[PDB]
Each structure stands twice: as C-alpha cells, then as structure tokens.
Amino acid sequence: SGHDQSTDVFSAEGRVFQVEYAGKAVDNSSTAVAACCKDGVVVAVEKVHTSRMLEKGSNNRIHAVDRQAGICICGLLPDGRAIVSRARQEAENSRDIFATPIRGSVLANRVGEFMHAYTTHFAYRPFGCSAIIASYADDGPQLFVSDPSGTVAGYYGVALGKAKTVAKSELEKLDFSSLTCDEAVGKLASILHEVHDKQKDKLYEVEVAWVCDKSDRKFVHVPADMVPAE
Amino acid sequence: TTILAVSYNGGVVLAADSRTSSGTYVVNRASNKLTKLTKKIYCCRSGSAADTQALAERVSNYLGSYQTDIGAGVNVATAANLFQKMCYMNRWNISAGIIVAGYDPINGGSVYSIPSGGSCVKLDYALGGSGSIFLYSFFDANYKPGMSKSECVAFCQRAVAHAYSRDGSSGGLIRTITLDADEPEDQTIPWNRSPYCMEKDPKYVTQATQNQPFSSSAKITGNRMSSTG
C-alpha cells in the first residue's frame, strides 16, 4: 500500500520500509571486507566491471577523507561519493575550526548523522550504500560501519555485500589480536577471491587500502605488487 | 593591565594584575583577568573588558560542547585556534589581547599569544597589556627557562609586581594560577605583601633635592623641610 512509499511514514509494526529497501539495494552490491589489526585498519573491496575496456582504477570505491581517514562504499557509488564529500567536509571543519585531526569515532558519528537525516523527511530518500570508515587518529585504529539507516557500529572485522555471510564466516577464523596489517591485506584479498563467484561476475578486480604505522598513519592504497594474484 | 604566562616543565603559570581603570580612575581594583575556558585551559584578557569577556564566554561555550561531542579532553591548540579565528573575524570592531595557556596530556603545557592584530604565536612565555612593555627587558635579563613550578610562580609574581610598579594602568592584587597534570591551583597576593614596589625599595627612600634653602653658597645641602630651617 502507501505505507512504504516515503521515509516519513512508520509501518504498523514500527518499521521504515524505504530504509529497508535501501539496505536491500546495499545487500545486492559487491562484497567488501575490513579488519582492525590493533596497529591499523585494512579495507578490501571487489569491483565488478561490465566492460573489459575500462581503464585501470575506474569506479574507485575507496576514497581518502582525511590524511588518516578513508571511506569504502558498498552499494550505489554516486551516493557513496556524496557521503564521502560530506565526510571530507566534516574532516576539514575539524582541521580548520579546532586545529586537530578528526577522531575516527567522531567522523563515524558525523557520517551516521548525515545518513540518518535522509531517512526522516518525505522530500528525500535514504542513501543506497553502506560506508566503511577506516581511521587511524589519536584514538588509535578505528573501523566503523554506517548503515543506510544511519546507525554506526565499530568492528574488529566486518563484511558487507552480496557474499556477506561467507565472507563474515571466513573473517571469524582470524585472531584480530595477533593479526597485523601486512598479513591482513593478503588475508582479506584471499577471502574476497575465494568468496566471489567466477561464473557470474566475469570481470572483477580487488582494490585494497590501509592506514597503519607503515604509511606514517596515512590512508593510502596498497602498493600494486602486494595483493595476491588470486 | 598586566598579563603574562610562563611555561615550566610540567605545565603553565598564568599571572595577572587586578585593575580595571577608566583612563585615570580605578573602576575596579579586584578584577579577575584569568578567565576559565576548560578545567585545564585559561586565558589572560587585556583591552576592552566587555569584548574580552564576550570572547571568552563564547569560546568556553564552544569548547564545553566540543568535549561532550568528542568525549575526550581539549588541547590548548584548539582553544588558541578558536580565539584566533574569533579575534581575526572581529579585529576591526574589538580591542582585545589574549593569552591562551593551559595543559593537555598530549602536548603538555602550552602558551599562545593572540595580539590585537589577530595572529597566534606559540611561545614559551607571553606578555600582554599596557604593563607588558616594562617586562620585556625584565625577561631578557632575569628570566631563565626551565624553572620549577614554585620558582615559576614566584618569578611570575615578581614580574607582575615590577610591571605595575611602573605602570599607572596596572596595580592592585596579583593573581596567579598553575595549570598542569595535577589539580590547578590559584593564588591571590595583595599589594601590601607584593614581592616588589618602589615604596619599600631602599634606593628610592632619599628624596630628590629640589627645594633648596636660600643659601650663600652653591653647595647642595638637601631640601628645606622647615620654615626656620
């Protein structure tokens, strides 16, 4: 009926169905994984290409928000770009008004508040993407996930996308206390390669980024010759 | 107005006079120019009282909300940046010289000077107010960096006393506050117990020989203090 056409309407059981539909759109997107390794955060996403003529690096889903913070997008890429722009605005406001890098928890809370505001008004629709915030700020390594509903949660390891449950199960086999980013990059790449179906997504690429002590606490992409071939 | 802040190894000491003067009349002789921003961060205010009070209240309100938002403490650099921005956007309408001094667990004790122009300089020590002009050569000669907490407090009080001994716009009580990893501690010493004043200085006891008695000689023999003599 008309109980699921706009976000400003609660259902008879207290649900917002448009947000659930946006989350369903997120659940049909490419798989992403992330791990907090007690010395940094490593995020790895799979990019599915519908053409073999795409230039390398096309449709980047991992974007640096600050020097030490970055966001991976799982879902509608343009919505993720808007969220990344908002996060970059939040990060530079802290560096300009308060003369300090934005803490990972603070940035995650700002992203969640921004995403939640689009689930309360009839004139807007919720974002169709989940945001993975990887930061190495003065509060240590931080890994957060922001839901299209606007709720944020901190994780040691997290998986999102179509092949989410199997990737989460593979992540359950790690220790996350002795785990280091150097081996975590390979672990996440191997998990993404193993969990991906090779007969439906012919063109696939693994895009991995990280921010730990080895990059001077700067959120950058991996060196090209570090991820496994497959 | 005489304000200053000096950094020691642990934290900072902020010192100020207590005198609000309407040109040549003392409107207030027990002012408090050390204004609390956070628990461990304070500011010394010089210039327009209303402008500095409004600036400090606005910055303190901004910082109090920021602590709740981030759930952690505030660095001295954040308060210095807040004053620098707010004083730079209003530099043509306000008359304010600010010293932002405090302690944070990350950078220890910090002192920042924000003059009337609106700049922000991180310094080991900062001076401000009309009476600061008397202290520069006092710091070049008598100040040695690396003093202890008590030594820093004593030196700050002595410097403030020397400053308002010569400055007519400064005087009254000397207020000091120490900000470090421990509990901040304040102190107010009165004028009659001040570490220095020219009234108690033995080298200014003898009066200048101006009122010569009528004499038959060019020899100078002191002032005439009696009608007969």
B72 in the Ramachandran plot: left (φ > 0), alpha (ψ -120 to 50) or beta?
beta
Please give the method by which this entry was determined.
cryo-EM
B24 is catalytic: no
Task: Identify the bridge partners of residue A41 per DSSP, sorted by sequence position.
Answer: A36, A211
Do residues B87 and B114 lie in contact, with contact meaning Cβ atoms separated by under 8 Å?
yes
Do residues A64 and A92 lie in contact, with contact meaning Cβ atoms separated by under 8 Å?
no
Q: How far apart are CA A113 and CA A103, in angstroms?
A: 15
Name residues whose C-beta falls within 8 Å of residue A108's C-beta, 6 or more positions apart in sequence: A133, A135, A142, A144, A146, A152, A154
Rg (CA), chain B: 21
Name residues whose C-beta falls within 8 Å of residue A92's C-beta, 6 or more positions apart in sequence: A66
> Which two three-digit tokens encode residue B69?
């938002």
Distances (CA, A) of A40 to A183, A211, B106, B169: 12, 6, 20, 56
Name residues whose C-beta falls within 8 Å of residue B156's C-beta, 6 or more positions apart in sequence: B4, B6, B13, B14, B15, B176
Tokens 């994780």, located at residue = A155
**CA B82 distance to own-chain centroid:** 21
A88 — phi, psi (to 5°)? -65, -40
**Which H or E run includes B76?**
helix B76-89
Residue of chain B with shortest Cα separation from A102:
B70
Name residues whose C-beta falls within 8 Å of residue B158's C-beta, 6 or more positions apart in sequence: B195, B196
DSSP state of B173: -
Domain range B3-204, its CATH number among 1.25.40.10, 3.30.70.2190, 3.60.20.10, 3.30.930.10: 3.60.20.10
DSSP state of B205: -
Q: How far apart are CA B175 and CA B32, in angstroms?
A: 7
Residue A121 buriedness (CB in 10 A; 0-12 / 13-18 / 19+): exposed
A126 in the Ramachandran plot: left (φ > 0), alpha (ψ -120 to 50) or beta?
beta
- Beta-strand pair B34-36/A129-137: unpaired
B45 — phi, psi (to 5°)? -110, 135
DSSP state of B33: -
Distances (CA, A) of A73 to A41, A44, A133, A161: 15, 11, 9, 10
Do residues B34 and B42 lie in contact, with contact meaning Cβ atoms separated by under 8 Å?
yes
Strand ordering across the sheet containing A62-64: A62-64, A69-75, A129-137, A140-146, A152-154
Do residues B221 and B215 lie in contact, with contact meaning Cβ atoms separated by under 8 Å?
yes
B84 — phi, psi (to 5°)? -60, -45
Largest CA distance in chain B: 85
Give the up-direction half-sphere exposure of residue A29: CA atoms within 13 A in the CB hemisphere: 27
Instruction: Give DSSP secondary structure letters for chain A.
Output: -GGGS-TT---TTS--HHHHHHHHHHHTSPPEEEEE-SSEEEEEEEEEES-TTPPTTTT--EEESSSSEEEEEEE-HHHHHHHHHHHHHHHHHHHHHSSSPPPHHHHHHHHHHHHHGGGS-TT----SEEEEEEEEETTEEEEEEE-TTS-EEE-SEEEESTTHHHHHHHHTT--SSS--HHHHHHHHHHHHHHHS-TTT--EEEEEEEEEEGGGTS--EEPPGGGS---
Q: How far apart are CA A60 and CA A73, in angstroms?
A: 9
Q: How far apart are CA A169 and CA A33, in angstroms?
A: 11
Task: Please tell me what resolution, in angstroms, this structure has.
Answer: 2.7
| A106 interaction partners in chain B (CB closer than 8 Å) | 69-70
A145 in the Ramachandran plot: left (φ > 0), alpha (ψ -120 to 50) or beta?
beta
**Which H or E run includes B228?**
none
A38 in the Ramachandran plot: left (φ > 0), alpha (ψ -120 to 50) or beta?
left
**Which H or E run includes B56?**
helix B49-70
- The closest CB to that of A99, out of B70, B81, B106, belongs to B81
Q: B193: helix, coil or strand?
A: helix
Interchain pair A103, B85: CB under 8 A: no
Interchain pair B72, A98: CB under 8 A: no
Q: B91: helix, coil or strand?
A: coil
Largest CA distance in chain A: 54
Interchain pair A98, B66: CB under 8 A: yes
Residue of chain A with shortest Cα separation from B63:
A98
> Which two three-digit tokens encode residue B193?
């117990």
| B69 interaction partners in chain A (CB closer than 8 Å) | 106
Do residues B116 and B20 lie in contact, with contact meaning Cβ atoms separated by under 8 Å?
no
| Minimal CA separation from B62 to chain A, in Å | 10
Rg (CA), chain A: 17
> Which two three-digit tokens encode residue A186?
């390979």
Q: How far apart are CA A77 and CA B118, in angstroms?
A: 43
Do residues A48 and A203 lie in contact, with contact meaning Cβ atoms separated by under 8 Å?
yes
Number of H helices, E strands in chain B: 4, 12
Do residues A77 and A47 lie in contact, with contact meaning Cβ atoms separated by under 8 Å?
no
Residue B122 buriedness (CB in 10 A; 0-12 / 13-18 / 19+): middle
